[PDB]
Design a protein around this ligand. Structure first.
Ligand SMILES: *[C@@H]1O[C@H](CO[C@@H]2O[C@@H](C)[C@@H](O)[C@@H](O)[C@@H]2O)[C@@H](O[C@@H]2O[C@H](CO)[C@@H](O[C@@H]3O[C@H](CO[C@H]4O[C@H](CO)[C@@H](O)[C@H](O)[C@@H]4O[C@@H]4O[C@H](CO)[C@@H](O[C@@H]5O[C@H](CO)[C@H](O)[C@H](O)[C@H]5O)[C@H](O)[C@H]4NC(C)=O)[C@@H](O)[C@H](O[C@H]4O[C@H](CO)[C@@H](O)[C@H](O)[C@@H]4O)[C@@H]3O)[C@H](O)[C@H]2NC(C)=O)[C@H](O)[C@H]1NC(C)=O
Ligand SMILES: *[C@@H]1O[C@H](CO[C@@H]2O[C@@H](C)[C@@H](O)[C@@H](O)[C@@H]2O)[C@@H](O[C@@H]2O[C@H](CO)[C@@H](O[C@@H]3O[C@H](CO[C@H]4O[C@H](CO)[C@@H](O)[C@H](O)[C@@H]4O[C@@H]4O[C@H](CO)[C@@H](O[C@@H]5O[C@H](CO)[C@H](O)[C@H](O)[C@H]5O)[C@H](O)[C@H]4NC(C)=O)[C@@H](O)[C@H](O[C@H]4O[C@H](CO)[C@@H](O)[C@H](O)[C@@H]4O)[C@@H]3O)[C@H](O)[C@H]2NC(C)=O)[C@H](O)[C@H]1NC(C)=O
Lengths: 208, 13, 207
């Protein structure tokens, strides 16, 4: 029988006024015989009508995927409104309902620190620039690196870790050719989170 | 004031 | 019928000569009408007879959890031997087999760097000491802290993260009262991994 999965907007989309956040309600296992699906959407319990159904997609396993998408206001999301998707179908003796919203709780401002490479790393072909981001809540966040106005893409970032004080932390690690460090290039850790001023902070790191 | 990320507008208070 | 889950030993257990690593075959959804479970263990295809069954345990959702534990030698595990559990139960159309072994590929030696707190953290109540560990393979590792030969427990460690060169890295973060840092105390990050000399290294950090 049909099953439903409801996904939140991307952190980046909710934090950048210049982007457009959306919630996505997915109905998998829709049968060939009863492909018709009804969507009702609710924002904190009030029905809204501006959703749009995405093109139907036939699946290798002889079922359809049906997707409804609802756009959302950044501040409705960040103020933690609850979005409810209700799915009805002939193969479903009862309508399925699903809800999401921002993780509940007081937002806390990340503290962002940059850490130079260890003196013991200085032997190696490349070195690690670290960015420690701690004391943040909720765990929705984006971390990116740049140098001289350009993205630096050779980085990996750890999953958020729940800390003993109820906030989260993570580390981001940017790997650069050691000569790029010795040359005094300034690298910057850019963090987006709701509890930062204008949702954004940048911390820089260069040879001392 | 505003925050930009790689030229792109993040937010303004 | 039942479901089978087969679990590896703790990295620490395979890495300390003193500990007993074991591999654990957990059978859930065993019925009340048919509690009898036959276990067959194979090490690289060779049947072995020294596994030990745990006391059966009622789950209160109409099923038993039935568990067989096989002790393993440290070198057998680390040499990449494959461990097979075969489960037979009257509720199975045929025996469920599962396998586990250590992850494959040249082990690689962690590079262990302790990083002091940022200057900007210095007017806060506590500071973060970072033990950054990278270049390790496989991902099985253990990280701990101490100071003046006493354990320091107020830390958290990230999961290992697959890096672009196909090794892993993680960071462990120890939080200490700012005063403890300022006064020149030495803090130590201890890392156990198969590819280190003596499955062990310790790096220290102080102001
Ligand atoms: C018949 O076939 C279909 C399709 O099978 C696919 O093709 C085959 C060939 C195989 O490769 C499959 O692996 C393929 O999926 C089967 O459909 C699958 O059913 C699953 C359950 O039955 C369902 O599992 C659940 O997945 C959740 C995560 O889903 C993510 O990620 C997976 C892979 O990582 C991806 O396949 C999904 O599409 C989905 O991806 C997300 O989509 C959302 C919405 O689009 C994205 O978010 C939006 O993105 C846009 C822009 O893109 C924008 O940013 C919006 O703002 C935003 O909303 C998001 O980015 C995507 N994420 C990623 C990573 O890509 C799990 O969370 C969930 O777990 C929960 O439920 C379980 C219980 O069932 C629990 O165990 C668990 O703990 C959780 O509670 C499920 O595991 C699959 O998603 C689904 N596949 C698809 C394509 O929908 C079908 O089952 C099969 N039927 C039969 C009868 O055989
Ligand atoms: C009836 O109830 C039972 C029991 O459940 C409990 O009781 C009821 C009342 C509820 O309250 C439950 O919430 C309780 O758990 C149900 O049994 C459950 O069935 C699930 C499958 O249906 C099964 O899920 C699978 O779990 C895997 C992980 O299991 C880990 O972690 C879980 C949760 O974190 C934990 O509960 C399990 O015990 C198990 O924990 C590990 O145990 C091993 C072995 O003992 C430990 O390793 C050993 O440690 C010792 C020292 O102790 C020594 O060092 C040894 O060397 C070493 O081997 C290990 O430390 C424990 N780890 C942790 C983290 O705690 C998942 O990985 C798995 O997913 C996989 O399979 C799926 C596809 O099949 C995939 O989707 C997925 O990607 C994976 O491939 C499953 O999700 C539960 O484990 C199981 N619960 C228990 C306790 O066994 C039963 O289902 C239910 N029946 C009905 C009909 O309702």
């Amino acid at each position: 029988g049909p099953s439903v999965f409801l996904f939140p907007p991307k952190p980046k989309d909710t934090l950048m006024i210049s982007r457009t956040p959306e919630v996505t309600c997915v109905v998998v296992d829709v049968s060939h015989e009863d492909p018709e699906v009804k969507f009702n959407w609710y924002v904190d319990g009030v029905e809204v009508h501006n959703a749009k159904t995405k093109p139907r997609e036939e699946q290798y396993n002889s079922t359809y995927r049906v997707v409804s998408v609802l756009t959302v206001l950044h501040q409705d999301w960040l103020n933690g409104k609850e979005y409810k998707c209700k799915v009805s179908n002939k193969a479903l003796p009862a309508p399925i309902e699903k809800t999401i919203s921002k993780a509940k709780g007081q937002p806390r401002e990340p503290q962002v620190y940059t850490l130079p490479p260890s003196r013991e790393e200085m032997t190696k072909n490349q070195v690690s620039l670290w960015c420690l981001v701690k004391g943040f809540y909720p765990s929705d966040i984006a971390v990116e690196w740049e140098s001289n106005g350009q993205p630096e893409n050779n980085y990996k970032t750890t999953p958020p870790v729940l800390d003993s004080d109820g906030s989260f932390f993570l580390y981001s690690k940017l790997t650069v050719d050691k000569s790029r460090w010795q040359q005094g290039n300034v690298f910057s850790c850019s963090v987006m989170h709701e509890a930062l001023h204008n949702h954004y902070t940048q911390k820089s790191l260069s040879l001392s | 004031d505003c925050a930009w990320h790689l030229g792109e507008l993040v937010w303004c208070t």
